[PDB]
Amino acid sequence: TLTPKEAVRLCALGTIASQPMRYSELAGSVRHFTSRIMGPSLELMGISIELLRYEGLVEAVDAMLAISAAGRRELHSLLTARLRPGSDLSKLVVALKMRFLGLMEAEERAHQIDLLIEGVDSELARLADLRGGEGGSALAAWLDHDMALLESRLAWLEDFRARL
Amino acid sequence: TLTPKEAVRLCALGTIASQPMRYSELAGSVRHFTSRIMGPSLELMGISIELLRYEGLVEAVDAMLAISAAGRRELHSLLTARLRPGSDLSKLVVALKMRFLGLMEAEERAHQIDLLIEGVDSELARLADLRGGEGGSALAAWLDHDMALLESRLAWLEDFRARL
Incomplete structure (x- = not known):
């Protein structure tokens, strides 16, 4: 089962995998999607999109960003992971x-x-x-x-x- | 919203509040109830009933145990606490x-x-x-x-x- 930081990463990597986006646009989208499903989720505010660029999961070209080969593997690994009745x-x-x-x-x-x-x-x-x-x-x-x-x-x- | 340790404590204090029980019986009941709702919950195995006796929430008489005045306040505090769409x-x-x-x-x-x-x-x-x-x-x-x-x-x- 995924950690809250991994769930937010899955949201970010999947969102950017479809179409390239500006940092602000990606952050806004992830924040909106996660908060609509989970409620305010104030503990996740620190889990920002800045770290993804740091690990080479996302690459540049408020910068315009896009997913990388490392990001796509991480995306599949996160996306094909089991749930649990533990974590609800x-x-x-x-x-x-x-x-x-x-x-x-x-x-x-x-x-x-x-x-x-x-x-x-x-x-x-x-x-x-x-x-x-x-x-x-x-x-x-x-x-x-x-x-x-x-x-x-x-x-x-x-x-x-x-x-x- | 409650922490996993607090949810297990709520289960233990509510179970013992109805009728006095032996340590083994209380531990078995909490384990069964929590695991039927949440699945195996292997991360909660360390959250044992021994600490409740340590804080004076439960009192003696594999010992026969019963709830105390401190345990009843903690029970009400835990029982009358909000949920969240965060924590699922x-x-x-x-x-x-x-x-x-x-x-x-x-x-x-x-x-x-x-x-x-x-x-x-x-x-x-x-x-x-x-x-x-x-x-x-x-x-x-x-x-x-x-x-x-x-x-x-x-x-x-x-x-x-x-x-x-």
Whole structure:
């Protein structure tokens, strides 16, 4: 499974592999893509595009940049790597909140469910932003699917909240 | 958002808060619960139940143990903490695989989708293990819901694989 720095690198190397770009454009794109999927991700702000040029993964010509042979190998290595159910700890935390819901006071239980609804709403809005009409891509297909499951989760949470 | 050590602590403190238990029983329960939700989680093996007794969060009477006043405060603090879309990096990694699917060779694309199916299958089996008949709890309700969304994801991935 990839480290957060490797996930950001995968995003940068894949983005630059399609078409050459200016440093500012690449940084802006990676920041937008990663933050729409993961939320603000403030811990990743230091993971900048400057290091890629340092290791010869990206080459020049606010400079216009492009991928290199070393960058393409790193790209394939990163891209063809396994996921894990480890590296999505929120599933455990939510499962623990559900399991120990009775240990909280009534008011606090309702509040915790309100917070989960707020989070799903927020996540749907970010994915809708990223999705933008005009399908065909694996990404557009995946985003439509992920949003459909999120809409079901939102309805389930609202049902739950209404039963409390 | 909680650290992995804090999530394991939440599991331990909530489990012991219901009924007193022997060290071995508590360790076994936490290991089973956390690993069914998160997969093997081999990096968390060092996060043992021994430290809880060290900080006075749990007290004695392979010793029989029980929660203390300090443990109950820590339990509430951990239990009433926000989640984040940060701390579930697999969403980004899968989104990146979908976005850059065209950059892989045809055989590798099919293989990557086979791996995602294998992961969802595995996750469903672990959650089915944890769920065990006899509803009513927030956890049973949440697990039935999460499994329903996972079954939809499995069907979507199989559809995707059949179109390649």
